[PDB]
């Protein structure tokens, strides 16, 4: 038939703002025709890894629903977006399954986010009581407690704030520059 009704992928990859990693943004995709060849063969990408399906196998197969997840992280922490990896971002912020079927994409966004003089728009979570379940999320900002003693509503010796800022600056190191990461999941039921 005459191909029409393409998917809104451009609304995701090209956007005004991107959510923080500990509050990663999620969108559902269904009843549209996607063209993964454009994304794979675009020249503006830096890390393109697919798990479970080859780039042409993406164009071959069809699936029920698609999920798109968006966040922003620093350079050295892009390695953590893969099954069976360790690190604070993976352990306490965002976790992938051990049998993941999808694709992981990351590209540099130095000019877009590293405004002159420093930025404070993005945050990540530093402490938690237990490891994150697959695709589990949390937004509550209760005062983290270490130790047996009860913690009041005031920061102190073993009462800590569970969030921290990224000090992005255009004059930073090679690995501290920002990176935008998109994770695509395909489920067939």
């Amino acid at each position, epitope marked *: 038939p005459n191909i029409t009704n393409l998917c809104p992928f451009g609304e995701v990859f090209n956007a005004t703002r991107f959510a923080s990693v500990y509050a990663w943004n999620r969108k559902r995709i269904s009843n549209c025709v996607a063209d993964y060849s454009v994304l794979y063969n675009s020249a503006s990408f830096s890390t393109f890894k697919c798990y479970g399906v080859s780039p042409t196998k993406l164009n071959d197969l069809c699936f029920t629903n698609v999920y798109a997840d968006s966040f922003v992280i620093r350079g050295d922490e892009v390695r953590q977006i893969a099954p069976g990896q360790t690190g604070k971002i993976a352990d306490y912020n965002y976790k992938l399954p051990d049998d993941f079927t999808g694709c992981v994409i990351a590209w540099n966004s130095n000019n877009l986010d590293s405004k002159v003089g420093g930025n404070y728009n993005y945050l990540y979570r530093l*402490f938690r009581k237990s490891n994150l379940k697959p695709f589990e999320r949390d937004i509550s900002t209760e005062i983290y407690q*270490a*130790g*047996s*003693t009860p913690c009041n509503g*005031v920061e*102190g*010796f073993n009462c*800590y704030f569970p969030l*921290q800022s990224y000090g992005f600056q255009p004059t930073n190191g090679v690995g501290y520059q920002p990176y935008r990461v998109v994770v695509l999941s395909f489920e067939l039921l």
Partner: antibody
Amino acid sequence: QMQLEQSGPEVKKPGTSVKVSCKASGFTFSSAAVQWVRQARGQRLEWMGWIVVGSGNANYAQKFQERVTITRDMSTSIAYMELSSLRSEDTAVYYCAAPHCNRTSCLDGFDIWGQGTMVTVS
Amino acid sequence: ASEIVLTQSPGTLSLSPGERATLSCRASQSVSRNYLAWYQQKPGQAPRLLIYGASSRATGIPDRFSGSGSGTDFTLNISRLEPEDFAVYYCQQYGSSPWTFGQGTKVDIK
């Protein structure tokens, strides 16, 4: 084994600046916190500042606010303190104190104590 | 002005070996979340942690050391002081900035 080992002696001319390190081993240093204490010969003890390792957020006494810089380096697990505008009153011995914590939590008290590094102002 | 100023009651204290003794460390306000601890120091040595929270005993601290306290008033007791137990003592508060020490106290054998 849990230990906190310091660099040792330092001798500086008056009016200069001095720097001290202490190196920590045997515990999850990413969760603990460090406190700096200074002692003069038979002159009790003097608290000056404390830092949280995970964030680097530091707090200083007013008397030592403009003269003391507290820094950490997580990759080598080192604590650094720098004092500027050295005076004759600065001939003393310095201590860094920190607890031991597993990943989950802390002992709610300071028990890992260093050995002490002497700073002399000639 | 300073937030909290501590005070140790006993001065130079002299005791016969094994004689029970008590020290007190009081303050102007109530320390937030009961943060007082005791440290023990010796000449040519670094301090060691004795008791945190005025009640809890640290690893390696014998049964002969005891403490208690609440609000403005805390106390420490030692019944059978061994000759090695005679040293200088200090009490610290770390509830609210800025944390402060006491004036110390010396214990000697009579």
